[PDB]
Design a protein around this nucleic acid. Structure first.
Lengths: 311, 314, 317, 317
RNA sequence: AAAAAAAAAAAAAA
RNA sequence: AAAAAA
RNA sequence: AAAAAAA
RNA sequence: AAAAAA
């Protein structure tokens, strides 16, 4: 009784990976989602070439990709995913032809094509969400060389254009920078570096992250934050008996209003009214089983905190 | 009985919306003004395509809009506005043709066309003023995600280039930024973010906002300010007998061009962002309010209007 | 025995303004230099059109200007300057033909044209200096609205393009910004906002500003600084007996030599914005002292931390 | 005896400059490599004109250059370099024709032309390395005007576009800013401002800079750092017996491995620029140490917090 | 040169 | 969640 | 100080 | 207030 969004992803993953797809390992799920995203974006070998306005170098790249032999059954995608013989049929029948537009399919009135396009959009959104979660998980232990200043970190994650398109509000990077650093329309979404993304194992089954479900410290931190976030958020996780790298969630951080006062009527602008009158003393709000609590900030990034506490 | 702008706005609104147009509802007036602005800007479905210098994407969008069926009679506008069967006649008659210019009509010498063009200009100005007021009102209890720093807030509101063209002195946005960044000639008007705009229910009637008018706190604040201004402006309002929702205006803020307080580096010295703050705590600044008895000064609260409105209601 | 540069300006002003041109009032000289500069840039009515690559709107503007009737004798320029009949003759005979280039005149070899072009260049430089000084003088009591941040104030004065062309070392504005926001060649000049410019009454007669020569407070301040600069420079002037708005110069600020104190990050070290202050952490900026060259010797004066504009406004009453 | 790159540079320099080319003088090699770069970028008088997309002004400049007479044999280059009569032969033979591309020659299949193009690429790389090192060596005792803020100093050195193209990993300037602001592809290289460039007299010989080499202090400092680096790097030098001017290298700094010390705002918290400096508000940034690899082993030297330009002039008094 | 992330080369190159 | 869309 | 040289 | 004008 899962939503069509997750059912489409489950069916696609099954058809493309046979029994080798394990629905309980975050790494396997993330790799499968990335492969499906690449397949549906027309980026694999042997697929159509993006030659609408491609430059000469991009022209040659796309031509080589199209001429390159497409993947074959039995290929190892990642570590524990093996392509089956049915993957070609799924790619041919479900992936929209390059350049397909929803308006054209809707005007055509073809129910099958409309449903296929809707499923494609849902799959793209789910795969992009999984990609964002995986990037957050990776960033916990290995930071990107580009992130050397607060401005650079402001646009994390750094994903591709299609990722930004499918989920504009969760994907940072160059496209989010351009959208923010440029003219913005009514349908503009602001990047949410800490939007709660359930782990892929919970995302694909419709399970919503909450208090009382077993998870890993890295898993929860990625779900609720990324590498450079404050380490105080680690208080949201509590190890179980014997540790064993598996604990439990005890709360989730809260996030909304502003306190800006624009200079008006000869007054001087204020960045924050509360400030007028303490940075290390700032506290975060955690929603516990009993009620909201305020926890003093650690002042150390989750990356540095994990590095220090590793040994 | 009314100026030309108010009279033409009332005539256009009545003709377009029948009796459904409520003249005492601010939301209805704002919706009608937005619809009229869209109509006169050829932004509605089935109107002339803007293709003079349009890029391929803009050409496609305009062609799609033109091919799309125009709004049908009886269509619901906003919440409590319904189009009449005679709106198409007014759209075809009173709307200047795309690319029309005042100089061309003046050369033509047709007095009726000159009157029509002046009416169109006045209607655009009135609609843009109403749009600015409604944007301010929305900002009071609905923060704009586009604003994250004082620089972003400096250009509020963010509206289309048509709005800036009609009322450059009241509309900010990207076009205002472009105008400010370039030179500033004699015709350039600085973006008055806190210019006094009577509420739409008063603007169309022409009753200039003044002390004693029965107005809501939110609407008065929108008229005199917007979401991200100081909460001290709330002192310009006073609930009437029995509390309720409508109070009375007790004062009007004034602004006397706060002088500069900067010192550039020279002869090896170092620049100072503010001579006073050098001496970083300063809440002594006061705002001048013109009350019936006289002009007084109120100490700033230093707290955002949006914050204060939600906090005091808890 | 004045230099040819100032002689040319004096002759031109006389020819164009008759006896109405006073060589002792600074407002009069500012207006005269502004008009003459306009005349030698073909920006007055009835002069040639700069149609080399003009846009449609600029095309219409210049066409209307060319068609527009030229100024007539007896016109009032400013407040105390009246044009004469000889102004048309001087314009025709001394104004280079629009688009004239010094290279072409030199190649042709005509001595008269070479001298005329040299005179025009000198007159342009003189009029640009006077315009810049008047910009600084007006900036003491009425700041430009464009000045709201130090970034904006870094380019003052904001003058037209030809002004920047003639005198690059004093004129700021969009053109100075563009030259800086780019690359510098072998002949790139650095904007010196506070370069000393003799007051116009002293510039047109060759008198060099020094100590012991009567001036007005605002005159000297515009000469050595402008509206936003520090108030300490006010100490360079001392009122005379009975005040009377006329005092005397007691010193001229000594401009410090360019010496950056940055230390960029390297080898894992951390960037420093200023070597001097980072060490002890004395972030206060109210101790820095300016150098004033007095009759006796160099002295250091503590800064006041308040703008000359605000200082004059407050001390006005 | 030498790799291809150094061999080709040696051959070209010898051919063009005869015996006037001294192989142990840094200024001589810098001037020679700059001239050879000019020749190989068609920036000398009497070479093809760059007009592919050149703007009207650029078209005029290039046409004037082409029309201008080319340098004549025996012309003085820099200070102690003189052209021979056989430089025209080398310029005509080994210089690729304007607009040549490696793909075109590869399609041609002429082995001689492929070798000549590879030699041209290697000579561009060598000349750009020498140009960068001389930029640093100038910066030690002559501050560049363009550098006024840490943002300005982030992009040193400021060189031409061809320099950035040939060696992107050392050369800054306008093109480095352009490439950094835009998309960062796989081939994108960051500006390693303080990369080790052996001194010219070591670079052409192929002798890698290491411990024990007899190097003047200024040249070593230009090798490892530049003008606005911290003075601590001066500890890598130790004057030899009898003081003199030539000392020896005692170590070679190491680029400290990255470890992010930032905390972005989230869940209502405030972003922190530096966790360490935060502490309890104590901003004492003088504990940072630079690694130095000595013969005995790796050590750490406490920073001095002063610019190399300042330190070099201060210690000479 | 810390079963799987600097230096030099070859494919790319205002 | 439905709609729209390099 | 000599040379060069626009929305 | 008026006159210009994507």
């Amino acid at each position: 009784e899962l939503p069509r969004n997750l059912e489409v992803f489950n069916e696609a993953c099954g058809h493309v990976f046979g029994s080798s797809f394990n629905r309980e390992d975050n790494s396997v799920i993330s790799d499968a989602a990335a492969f499906l995203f690449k397949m549906h974006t027309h980026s694999l070998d042997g697929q159509e070439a993006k030659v609408l306005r491609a430059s000469e170098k991009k022209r040659e790249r796309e031509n080589a990709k199209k001429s390159r032999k497409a993947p074959e059954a039995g290929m190892r995608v990642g570590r524990s995913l093996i392509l089956t013989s049915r993957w070609t049929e799924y790619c041919a029948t479900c992936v929209p032809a390059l350049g397909s537009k929803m308006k054209v399919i809707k005007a055509s009135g073809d129910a099958a094509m409309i449903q296929m396009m809707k499923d494609h959009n849902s799959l793209l959104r789910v795969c992009v969400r999984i990609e964002v979660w995986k990037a957050r998980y990776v960033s916990l232990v290995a930071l990107d060389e580009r992130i050397q200043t607060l401005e650079d970190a402001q646009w994390f994650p750094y994903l591709s254009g299609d990722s930004y398109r499918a989920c504009p509000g969760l994907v940072g990077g160059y496209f989010a920078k351009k959208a923010a650093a440029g003219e913005r329309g009514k349908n503009y979404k602001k990047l949410n570096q800490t939007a709660i993304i359930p782990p892929p194992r919970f995302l694909i089954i419709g399970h919503r992250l909450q208090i009382g479900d077993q998870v890993t410290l890295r898993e929860l931190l990625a779900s609720i934050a990324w590498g450079l976030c404050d380490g105080v958020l680690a208080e949201c996780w509590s190890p179980s008996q014997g540790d064993g790298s598996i604990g439990v969630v005890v709360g989730l951080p809260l996030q909304g209003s502003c306190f800006l006062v624009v200079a008006s009527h000869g007054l001087s602008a204020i960045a924050d009214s509360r400030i007028e009158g303490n940075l290390l003393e700032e506290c975060i709000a955690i929603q516990k089983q009993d009620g909201v609590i305020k926890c003093k900030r650690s002042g150390k990034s989750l990356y540095h905190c994990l590095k220090e506490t590793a040994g």
